[PDB]
Amino acid sequence: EVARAQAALAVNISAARGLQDVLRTNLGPKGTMKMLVSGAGDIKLTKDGNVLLHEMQIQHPTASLIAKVATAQDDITGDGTTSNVLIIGELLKQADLYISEGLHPRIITEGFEAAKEKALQFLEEVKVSREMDRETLIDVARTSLRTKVHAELADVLTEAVVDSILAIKKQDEPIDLFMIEIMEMKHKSETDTSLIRGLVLDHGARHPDMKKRVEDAYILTCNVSLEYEKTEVNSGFFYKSAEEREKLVKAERKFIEDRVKKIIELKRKVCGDSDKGFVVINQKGIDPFSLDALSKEGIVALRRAKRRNMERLTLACGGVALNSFDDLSPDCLGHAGLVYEYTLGEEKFTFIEKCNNPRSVTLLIKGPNKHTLTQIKDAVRDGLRAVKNAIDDGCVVPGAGAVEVAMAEALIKHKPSVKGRAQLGVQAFADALLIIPKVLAQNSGFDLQETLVKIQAEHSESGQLVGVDLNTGEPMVAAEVGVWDNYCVKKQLLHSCTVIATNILLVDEIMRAG
């Protein structure tokens, strides 16, 4: 079929609206989490702009298009993405009128540009260079956390969030690459969350009391087993022919104690003293007697370790992954400043913590392991992006859309065009800005009206960035509030909202292709 001209955009405008309504609170602590059945058929809860999109199976092309484009920004920030859907279709709701008044969507796409630039100009003029204080990091962390979860949940989790990034900036890494390791853990309540400067393995191998409490940890990560097999035929060697099986029966049990006593050597090679617990870590299993022959010597051998840990352990401890054991010095097997196998429930989760150059900080969350515990697994990594963004930009402003007004004010107050053609677009342009802070207030409390004419006159009074109190519905200084817009965060929505609106605002013929 064909939805011609005005009809094609009438589809575009609509598909934006109802979803924007969902996200008027998906955003802020006021933001209401949303759940998904038909997205899978699973019981699924999520709060965030882009992920909920992908989670749902979204038949409508607009939403289908959006999940991809908001991604690129949701890649960066994670919050303001739950914001981003509003301004876009709202701008459609702006301009469609003008083309319903009659006009070219051309000149309005045109018109948005210089407004986008003055915004981009204003984005510079607004963005407040701020410091790297963990405090300054906390409020940027928690505002995204506050957006995505409860402020309490934001608060209690914020610390570990703004902590690891300090050690990942200890690497002088401008972003967060490692220390991104999150661990959900068996618990009655998601209340428990811990910050492990080192890593956590989940296993003690199968053998307790190996000297599993380890202060001096020289980390052997060995992807090869001490358990090849205890029976006749080798681990990968299978035989249904009789004479070939009698061949492997003798040395299969041996090549274990080959690798076993290599460690028993390697223990004394590393240590010479059972005093320092030497940590063997296996990506695969390890024989009980292997553990036994190791454990009694004080060797703590771990089996069935995870490849990311193997990666992490190699990196965090200055560790090593090994396909052989033999004998090596303590440092040839990277060092963890502390290692403790920690049993919660049945599983003993090895705390390998403050590894030498603890390049990977495991953030451990002990919870019901529901999607509720998954529901808090996002805001953190989301907030991680935010502080990473805050790490990225020293320039960060008040949140709660204090910029919106100060944008919408100046950008509109002056004609950046001193034209109709661009100002027409500019008019629509900076108007769709204010959607967020007013509706937040309007969702919180006081209507769009008062808060705006508050915050506008306030900004008009101020030039300070004054922004909504999301628990009141009238503005405050969001610099003082703590809800803080990273220039890295806030900038990209200006890119997206414009650049997406550009081509989608210009369509007339639409048809099934193929």
Next chain:
Amino acid sequence: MLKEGAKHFSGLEEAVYRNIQACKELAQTTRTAYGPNGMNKMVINHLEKLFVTNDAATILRELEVQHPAAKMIVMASHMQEQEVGDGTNFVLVFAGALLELAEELLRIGLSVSEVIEGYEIACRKAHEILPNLVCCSAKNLRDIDEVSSLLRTSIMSKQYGNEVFLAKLIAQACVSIFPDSGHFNVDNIRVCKILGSGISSSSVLHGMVFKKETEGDVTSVKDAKIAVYSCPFDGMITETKGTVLIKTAEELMNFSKGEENLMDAQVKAIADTGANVVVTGGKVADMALHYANKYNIMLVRLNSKWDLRRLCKTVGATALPRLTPPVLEEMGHCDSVYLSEVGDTQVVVFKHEKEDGAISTIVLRGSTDNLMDDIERAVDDGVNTFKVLTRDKRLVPGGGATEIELAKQITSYGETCPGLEQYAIKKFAEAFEAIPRALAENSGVKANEVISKLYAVHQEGNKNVGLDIEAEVPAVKDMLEAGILDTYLGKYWAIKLATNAAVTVLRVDQ
């Protein structure tokens, strides 16, 4: 939505209606299911078998709704049932009841957070004032009464009259063997239900009670090295050839004898590994039996996994099919491993006594399964309510003499704390009346009639509803002392728990 996209079934009206309404659906019976309950519920479980109870969780897990609203909150009700044996009958009703104030406040037009947060701080205020209403504490597990006194409350919160012989029979199962200090175990004390005798013939044999026929002789030793096996007899006779027995006339000769010597070696290897009791979820065979009679290793003819499971659980046994010489890994645990006739049913009996690790095994002699399993249900959720793991349970009025105190506490205070939250704080003190109603439900009078008088009992902690007419006309039964209190904790969770999901399930418009 309007657009072909947007997967969801929840939202907006259907949230402020159907979700809460679907939440309303299931709490309906939980009202009849908590406190003294004269009500009863037929259930077929996909056996088509009827069963009767007052408990929701047994039923609700079965029930399947489109909407996670029902699907979620049960987890909290489980989260209760996980931590606390009963009150789960209540844990659902309050939330569902407290919820529907919101949709009213939504018709009254109160915001999500606005409606939510009032309950929140009031819930904290509750969690603040809730321990202030601790009216007692438990004392001694060794004491049967000190235990049984409470235990009725949960059995009550399942079924009313039976609780008396039961609660005593429970601490007589020795809840006391465990300290209830950082430890307690069902599987050690596990209910074992003997169909037959009387239902009040339900007994206590400390140490395992296995209704399974106790074969061979009594165990070779009472310490018995216990090798439990899933199917150590798959048969040592093979099923092959023509008749699904034999084909050639020469076939039968080797079929019959082969079972013997294999089982002979098998049951010899039971003695060769040293297992002093043989447990076959696999079949019993008289030769193997006679071998188990020769080698004198007590035999178990058939096993539910529960047998194998507990044997795997308790003994440290491992049930494995052995067409294989048995090898003790299972080894022994229980210091006295017996044959017994309990209910005069052959009862496989293992016993070992330890402050922690002792099996003190509830043996229910009973006339009716359909009862004795629900009789099991209350004692289950009663001893699981005994599970607090505070020997002093910081008791509060049981059967809910609390709500009238708190329904007074909050909404009064609820106005003192100001702002539209106050109404959510004042709505917070309302759904307390649920069980006062839910009992007056099965008692048959008005909660208003109840609460008006039970507000007129004012600061009490004692007088409240129940069964009979003293929950009806006065609505006054002493739910501090009928002998009935409840732990602060199981109470403390329900508020805390039913705070969460209720708050939660509202937030979600998708």
Next chain:
Amino acid sequence: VEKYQQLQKDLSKSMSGRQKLEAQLTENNIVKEELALLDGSNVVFKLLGPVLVKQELGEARATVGKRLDYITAEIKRYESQLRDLERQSEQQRETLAQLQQE
């Protein structure tokens, strides 16, 4: 079981010597060529059975028209014994196996 390959043997048995005949078939057409080009130059005996006999030319000729009856007869008959045995062999395969397994 025994009934499987009892039939496939005499299947394979009369299969090959039959195919031996196919070589001899060309020869039995070539022996119609060789003897017909023998006018009695070289002494023609039939080789027919173990007695090697002083023979005449028509005895040589009429024999190989009768020797083609080897390739004629032995080849044809087996295509019976092929399926004559094959089917009873195929028949007995699933019957006795399913038994001893069942």
Next chain:
Amino acid sequence: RESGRKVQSGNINAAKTIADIIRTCLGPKSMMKMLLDPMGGIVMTNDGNAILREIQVQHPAAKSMIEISRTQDEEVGDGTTSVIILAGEMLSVAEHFLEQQMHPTVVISAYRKALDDMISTLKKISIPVDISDSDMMLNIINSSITTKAISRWSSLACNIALDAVKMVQFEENGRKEIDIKKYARVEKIPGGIIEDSCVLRGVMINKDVTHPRMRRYIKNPRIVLLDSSLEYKKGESQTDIEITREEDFTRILQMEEEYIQQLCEDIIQLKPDVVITEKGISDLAQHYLMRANITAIRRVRKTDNNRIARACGARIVSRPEELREDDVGTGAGLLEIKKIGDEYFTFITDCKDPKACTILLRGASKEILSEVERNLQDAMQVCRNVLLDPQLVPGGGASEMAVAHALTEKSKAMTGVEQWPYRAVAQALEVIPRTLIQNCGASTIRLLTSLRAKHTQENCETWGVNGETGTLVDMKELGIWEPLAVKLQTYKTAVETAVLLLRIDDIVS
């Protein structure tokens, strides 16, 4: 079996319904069509060639419409969107009238006479270019890559193509074709930057060479293209039974090996260090070149070897006895297999072939190259259009409204029936400036009349409306330009199907 007016209208209905948003797609200001799929795949594109394939074709004329768009897409690839524009117009505007006024032919005849009038008018308004000045070209090429709207990398692709196209410029039919594109050979290289990408004499062969192909660096020494007649003879001068068995190996290889010797010893005289065997390549052949003390190269595409016939610039010879530098591998030759990124690349330099440099393209990635690569493929089409036609003509309404008045005056001077086709054709022109005004966001009939006033006086010499700025403009001053050729061609093509669909009165089976 469908026919006649209904088809004649359906032809329009088929053809015309396409161009609607497709004309808005014209110009950098463009309205992408959304193409959803029955699958649900969404497509935003201003380019018909993509749009044409993806859409359900409702009519065989649309099937025919595809043809001439593919034609121009094959013809040049520039203005493919524009070829279906005025084809419908001619039909759309007049057709129903003049067949109701009864004739296919009077319009059909008035297709040509309107056609050359533009061509005649073009060559006046199309004004020559400096190909001597690469920038006199480049500015158009820059105007062309800003038509492709990449001025970032492709402004270099401009030069690289231009520099190449000026070098791949040559050909002789005796009429001496200006460019030759089938000479032009790009490369696709990861590693290096496209700014470091260049063009060198002859055809660079990366096509068969991503790895060792002809040694590495063969400095002077020759590469030998083989169109022989090299097939190792099973006998001496005769072919005999193939080799199934030891005797056949012995006897025949006796006769085989000496023939490749008889052959590739005639190769060793031309001074190869490398011999690339396209024909006669067989187990013995290349085996003897290492015995002929020359590198042998196996089972290669003659496309290269023809490119290579433009690289060292030689011919290729089937002569078994006569194999030489002039026969194959002319010039001193430079055979250089360089690893640019991770891939070893034969560069055949020292071209003996007129001009003739071909394109090194090395991007830091394949992808960073590709953005240059496509517009460089576009610029060469542009450059050659400047080369084929060295008259730059002002883009848009300047070239548009100009011809119209001629056509009208033509029609008016003819004052027959065919006046109406020209009146249709002259008005058929005005769509694109209107479309550009449609595209820009201004009021066209004003700007149209305004542009008429631009012709009423100026004759719209350099004056169209400029769809970007949406104003009456000096396309000379703007530097808005284009070759007459693609202007002519795309237009001359737009005439053709209108001739077709008007000719065709019967759609049957």
